[PDB]
Design a protein around this ligand. Sequence first.
Ligand SMILES: *CC(=O)NCc1cc(Br)cs1
Length: 225
Amino acid sequence: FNLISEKCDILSILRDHPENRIYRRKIEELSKRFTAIRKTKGDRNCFYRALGYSYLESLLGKSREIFKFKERVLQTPNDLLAAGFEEHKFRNFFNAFYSVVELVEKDGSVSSLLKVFNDQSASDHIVQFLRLLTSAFIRNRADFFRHFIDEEMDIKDFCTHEVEPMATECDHIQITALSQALSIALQVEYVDEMDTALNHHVFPEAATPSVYLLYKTSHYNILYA
Ligand SMILES: *CC(=O)NCc1cc(Br)cs1
């Protein structure tokens, strides 16, 4: 369980910040709202890897929601082609993601899903697919990322350098784009060392979340309500 850990009690993360009054306060407050956490490996890929696992885990046993998600995933090669990606270069990554979606439908266990996301090969193929889909979704909507995010920003260079490569860290643009590309509603809780309120943001702003993530010391961990 080196990439995505077993579930632990929320207060178990006090030991990560011993004798720290702000982190202790904020972790105690978090424990009032959430019961459990899973840790992710801090390798630069942890947003993609956490969102992918947590969203697919939330679909287990839900036959209509699985059917509708699979229908969207089958169309994602068209998003990649429209942005200039070539099929023979994304085939291996697309097939690895479609395979894990079929696993959620056919096998339906947490144990089988966690084993795929802890297999370095399968899990890194899934992450690479998610990064290429993020890139494509931004490229195909460049005026929207420039109008609402980014008036002065160079979109194509941003995607080349800060989205497509393995181990590149995320900001609001990548989170917004991947949420929109797969129709995933997520809430991110922020725990920093300033003496401020514990606070969160929802992507998209409207939504009732499927997935909760904790952003602390540059890492995205998975929370359970
Ligand atoms: C999400 C993720 O992989 N984070 C990588 C990190 C960078 C630092 Br500093 C700590 S974890």
